[PDB]
Design a protein around this ligand. Sequence first.
Ligand SMILES: COC1=C(OC)C(=O)C(C/C=C(/C)CC/C=C(\C)CC/C=C(\C)CC/C=C(\C)CC/C=C(/C)CC/C=C(\C)CC/C=C(\C)CC/C=C(/C)CC/C=C(\C)CCC=C(C)C)=C(C)C1=O
Ligand SMILES: COC1=C(OC)C(=O)C(C/C=C(\C)CC/C=C(/C)CC/C=C(\C)CC/C=C(\C)CC/C=C(/C)CC/C=C(\C)CC/C=C(/C)CC/C=C(\C)CC/C=C(\C)CCC=C(C)C)=C(C)C1=O
Ligand SMILES: COC1=C(OC)C(=O)C(C/C=C(\C)CC/C=C(/C)CC/C=C(\C)CC/C=C(\C)CC/C=C(\C)CC/C=C(\C)CC/C=C(\C)CC/C=C(\C)CC/C=C(\C)CCC=C(C)C)=C(C)C1=O
Ligand code: HEC
Ligand code: HEM
Ligand code: HEM
Ligand code: HEM
Ligand code: HEM
Lengths: 51, 55, 62, 241, 379, 379
Amino acid sequence: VTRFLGPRYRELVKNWVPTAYTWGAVGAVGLVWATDWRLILDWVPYINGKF
Amino acid sequence: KGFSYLVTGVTTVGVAYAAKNAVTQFVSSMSASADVLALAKIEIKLSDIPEGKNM
Amino acid sequence: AAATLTSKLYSLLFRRTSTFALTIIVGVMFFERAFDQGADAIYDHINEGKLWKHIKHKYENK
Amino acid sequence: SDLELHPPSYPWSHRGLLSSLDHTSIRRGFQVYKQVCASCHSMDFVAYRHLVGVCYTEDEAKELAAEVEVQDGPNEDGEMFMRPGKLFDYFPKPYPNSEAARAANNGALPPDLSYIVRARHGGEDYVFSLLTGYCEPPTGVSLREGLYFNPYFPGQAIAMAPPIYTDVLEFDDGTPATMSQIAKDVCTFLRWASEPEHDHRKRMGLKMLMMMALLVPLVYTIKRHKWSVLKSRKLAYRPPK
Amino acid sequence: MTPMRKTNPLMKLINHSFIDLPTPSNISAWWNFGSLLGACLILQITTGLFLAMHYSPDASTAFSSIAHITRDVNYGWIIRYLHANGASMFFICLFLHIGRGLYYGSFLYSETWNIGIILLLATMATAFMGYVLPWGQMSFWGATVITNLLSAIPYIGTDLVQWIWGGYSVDSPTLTRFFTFHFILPFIIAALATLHLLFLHETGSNNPLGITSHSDKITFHPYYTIKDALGLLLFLLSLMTLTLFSPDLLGDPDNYTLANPLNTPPHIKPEWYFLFAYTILRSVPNKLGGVLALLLSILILAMIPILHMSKQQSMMFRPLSQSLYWLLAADLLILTWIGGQPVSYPFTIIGQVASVLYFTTILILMPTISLIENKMLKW
Amino acid sequence: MTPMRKTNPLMKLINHSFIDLPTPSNISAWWNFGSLLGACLILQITTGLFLAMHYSPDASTAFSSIAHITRDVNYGWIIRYLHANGASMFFICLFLHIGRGLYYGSFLYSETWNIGIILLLATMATAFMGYVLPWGQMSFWGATVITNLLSAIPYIGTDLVQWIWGGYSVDSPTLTRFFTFHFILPFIIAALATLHLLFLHETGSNNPLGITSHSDKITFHPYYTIKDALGLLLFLLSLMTLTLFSPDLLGDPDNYTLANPLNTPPHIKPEWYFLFAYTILRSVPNKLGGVLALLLSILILAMIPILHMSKQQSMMFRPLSQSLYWLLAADLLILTWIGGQPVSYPFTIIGQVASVLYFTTILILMPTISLIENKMLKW
Ligand SMILES: COC1=C(OC)C(=O)C(C/C=C(/C)CC/C=C(\C)CC/C=C(\C)CC/C=C(\C)CC/C=C(/C)CC/C=C(\C)CC/C=C(\C)CC/C=C(/C)CC/C=C(\C)CCC=C(C)C)=C(C)C1=O
Ligand SMILES: COC1=C(OC)C(=O)C(C/C=C(\C)CC/C=C(/C)CC/C=C(\C)CC/C=C(\C)CC/C=C(/C)CC/C=C(\C)CC/C=C(/C)CC/C=C(\C)CC/C=C(\C)CCC=C(C)C)=C(C)C1=O
Ligand SMILES: COC1=C(OC)C(=O)C(C/C=C(\C)CC/C=C(/C)CC/C=C(\C)CC/C=C(\C)CC/C=C(\C)CC/C=C(\C)CC/C=C(\C)CC/C=C(\C)CC/C=C(\C)CCC=C(C)C)=C(C)C1=O
Ligand code: HEC
Ligand code: HEM
Ligand code: HEM
Ligand code: HEM
Ligand code: HEM
């Protein structure tokens, strides 16, 4: 809300941004792997067991 | 430290592998029995039907 | 004198738990394909001729 | 009466812990079943499918199903008719009801073969010995005129006449037809009909074994790692004197 | 600033039971089966739930339904075998869970021990009604025999049997009610299990030595989690090996033939886990005698705490009691083996000797030797 | 010797939960519908349990089994009608339960209010799947429509509708699968109901005035056990009148005809307790948009605590808020009435107006009037 605005909150979010990126990537890669979503797994380097 | 954490890291891989497989089995059981697919979509039909006739 | 392989693997990946999880899941992605293919090849090599996929040749394409 | 003669353990190609079923044997085994068995025995839980990926191709199975004739649902504004048959019809039963079957077989009811292997002790080993070993009764035993002696039957008297001899059929493969040969093929086919997950079951077993081999030492190592602090702990007692 | 698992009510319970539970440090593997039992239950439940989506609880289509599951339902065969094989594993762990308490003297926890007796009877009922569901020859006839065993009641008799059957014999109505009872009881066992753990926490776990462990208690989260996670891995290894290599080893054929009210197989032996009691029944010619024996058997477990006379919990320090314990175990093995054999002269006499030896050892020998050991220790 | 109810583990929970927890003295009859809900839940289980002893979940024998229960089975008709009519009474109590919270400000108990929302969603699922079990003409098409309305999901819808069906239509596999879910789900609801009470107990119940009642608390047992007993008697009166005189008034005929796949009835409608939602989706022109509306609605109940901006908990001293509350209640009545009428110009516009009025009331009007009321009192 209104109170959360402030310079130090900006610093905190900038500190934690890389961690959020890594977790977001973990979730994305995990979802595709669990669901074996073909469209994105057809552009991988060597994982092409599907015909 | 790196050695010990490696063991843990490798172990999780195995646990993950089986986990996915197990779930895919139980979920797949709900998809459709083989008989459902056999009875459905099997509608090959000859083109010999004359003009105006309706088989 | 070269830094041990495990030490490099720790500082870059294992130190941060988020990267530790990321490398785990990528390893699962890769190991799944490798393990599956290897096991299947072994099973087929144990039973050449018995499995019907090796029999298709004698009768196929009419 | 007397304790039944236990069949011996034969060297089947799938007795091994990781072996599979020779699928050419199943193909010839089914070929035997198509006419010699189906006269009075029935397979209630098998369809003309289940064979596409095992023995026969798509097109050959469809052509084979066309050779049979089933009875179809009631024609609209009509009555029942006869349909050729497609790859969703189970194998034709030989008699409409059990009682009719008994009448045509001197009162004996031929059991369904879908689960016969898992139903009887010894499995296919029992069937193979049963199909063979149709000897004459020893000295001191008599039998009803419509019964036959078989030392492997639990009563030694069976209404089955010897069904298989040499040259009854002619395999398209060219394999010579021999009582032992036909028995081996049909027994393999029956073992499949009671367990079509055989190959898949063992493949999953192979993967399970290797996965356990990797995992069990790893998990034990983690347990030892965490517990080391307790297993090496040393204690001391220092009262005031 | 303080930990959040010490404020939220739902986390207080988890913290008490799981994370910060004070537990003795020297407990051996025997203390793992407890957890495994619950794990196996959680497996059964889920496995069965998936089988229920394709099962028809009718006397004319139940057998065909199972045949359809194993041939048309994706991975139906594995699910069915896991359920069947997982039931035997349940009993194996359950028998080893009860043996530990008998050996180490855990029965002194009256409340917990009594709750267990109830849990055992509830699980026994669940397994019996489950085994009749397939509607095979053994299923049909096994229910008939066990259900006709209530006719021994003096004056009511037939009324209960006909009431349970919903008719004059065993037929579809019996199947349907058993299906519902099979479905529900496991969830009732879960509630009983929570009461089991409830009364346990007030006192804590008993160490193998039998001495107070209050000086060497440790937390549960880091140590027994991994130790109980290794046990569960071994449990799965055994279960998967049984399912994937010997799917039909602890079972019996004639369950793959349709039930016939007219025909009856000769041996008609029940399931292996219900064999020791079966021999006890056949050992006594009278029907009323046999049923009383069966009941008196389970009742002994309730009376065991009253029969204790030694001044120690564990038999680790009492070797004579240990030897008697192992002889009793061997007697149970003989009872099981006899149950699997036909009725004949040698088996019948051996069964009678085993039955009398069973009862005498528990009711007579154990208290006497306990007093003797108290004498040689100048207590 | 002190009372045993304060020392036995099992008795401590019963004493805390029922016998002795302090309660406000002034709580009105509105605070009596919570206990009734559980009672109804209990009633719904037992009756359904007995029905499960005779029901056959198959596309062909499901309708026949219901007829068999109603006529041949002893007292089957009364059991079926208690089950059917108990469902409607459950929802009536449930709506009154929710209404009390909105009026007296009980939603301020966030943890308890959020758990309630889950209980409501689970309840609706149980009721919807149960309505398919009779397998009548309305049941088949009701399931068909309420399931085909997931094909609007961006990219997975079509894949996640056939998977639910177990095929490319609605047939026996759906029926059996729904049967298992119908059985299991209510027991989960029972477990969740214990989390509801648990989170409530750590703070205490509210009173109509909205002021804390620590000054005038009272032991629950004597006063409120008899009061809740009186409520239960009245609840039974209503239920028995419905079943014993006019059992079928609240049902919809044409459910007594065998389900015909190739025959769409002219007027498909959900059950009375679900109608309010049906009209909210039938009005939105976009298929996906209608699903987003039916969901965004139910969840505004979760948003109520945020939109609260008054400085008084209870609307008793807020005359303008009372007028809006009754206006919103009237709007729900209009939505219910429209749900049961055919598509046409007058009903459609009325439904559209009601939907927008429903939403705008909850979002804008209520906060704004609360602010004005605060300004009036010079806070
Ligand atoms: C007209 O046709 C129609 C009808 O008629 C015919 C209908 O009937 C319906 C209605 C639909 C009916 C059946 C179908 C819909 C079914 C569903 C949505 C649900 C799908 C699921 C079901 C079968 C399974 C149900 C799931 C179950 C049991 C799983 C839950 C299990 C548990 C133990 C519960 C445990 C939860 C635990 C631990 C969490 C603990 C905590 C909480 C509640 C606390 C809350 C936490 C939070 C963050 C929230 C707090 C938030 C705060 C401050 C922020 C404020 C929030 C905001 C949003 C602003 C429709 C749509 C329809 O078209
Ligand atoms: C206003 O203030 C208030 C509060 O705030 C201060 C409160 O908080 C509360 C408390 C809140 C409430 C109630 C609301 C809901 C909350 C709760 C905690 C409770 C949640 C509810 C539940 C889990 C459900 C409980 C149960 C229900 C319906 C019962 C279902 C389960 C069962 C056991 C029931 C019994 C079924 C039975 C017996 C079957 C009937 C058949 C019988 C005779 C025949 C049975 C035969 C057999 C088993 C035969 C077996 C044979 C076998 C093996 C053969 C053996 C043969 C041999 C030969 C040996 C209230 C009331 C209140 O007012
Ligand atoms: C040794 O030391 C130790 C101790 O002592 C010191 C201890 O004390 C402990 C203490 C702990 C224990 C022993 C642990 C165990 C303890 C216990 C009491 C045992 C308890 C066991 C249980 C509750 C059993 C748990 C499992 C249960 C009930 C089953 C779980 C699964 C399910 C209900 C099913 C879940 C879902 C599944 C498979 C997914 C499939 C289905 C679907 C998607 C659903 C399909 C759709 C529908 C319903 C439709 C809904 C929507 C509909 C109609 C429409 C929607 C709307 C539209 C518009 C379409 C331990 C560990 C220990 O070590
Ligand atoms: C073609 C090879 C063939 C096989 C394999 C086969 N049958 Fe049978 N079969 C029977 C009858 C009748 C029984 C029951 C008792 C008996 O064997 O006489 C039976 C029993 C059996 C049994 C064992 C019965 C038991 O209870 O153990 C097996 C196995 C079997 N058949 C399989 C009629 C036949 C007929 C009809 C002439 C033919 C052909 C026939 N059987 C040929 C075959
Ligand atoms: C049937 C399902 C059962 C479940 C899920 C279950 C669960 C558990 C669990 C998890 C424990 C903790 C294990 C430990 O700390 O050593 C335990 C302990 C115990 N169980 Fe059970 N149990 C079951 C059956 C039984 C039975 C049949 C008995 C018969 C007497 C029994 C008697 C005991 C006793 C006495 C303890 C305490 C052991 C000790 O304090 O050392 N349980 N139970
Ligand atoms: C401790 C809990 C349970 C035990 C010990 C148990 C035991 C058994 C056993 C031994 C069988 C027969 C296995 C066979 O014949 O090969 C069976 C069958 C069955 N059980 Fe249970 N069960 C349990 C829980 C459940 C639950 C919770 C369900 C819920 C649906 C369930 C549903 C079934 C079904 C559908 C069958 C039919 C088996 C088949 O068709 O092959 N079971 N059970
Ligand atoms: C569905 C089964 C439910 C049961 C068995 C149940 C049970 C209860 C009980 C017994 C009480 C205390 C006594 C009473 O308030 O009359 C209560 C209070 C409460 N319930 Fe429920 N409830 C259920 C569903 C819900 C739902 C759907 C909501 C949605 C908002 C809800 C919200 C609340 C709130 C906020 C309270 C606190 C009352 C206060 O503080 O005065 N409950 N519940
Ligand atoms: C809150 C809990 C429950 C609710 C709200 C509920 C609701 C319903 C409803 C509305 C019907 C439709 C009946 C009709 O239209 O005639 C139904 C049918 C049925 N339910 Fe329940 N039910 C509940 C619990 C249970 C339980 C626990 C069982 C079994 C253990 C069960 C078994 C059945 C059966 C067998 C039917 C078919 C009855 C018929 O076709 O008339 N129900 N349920």
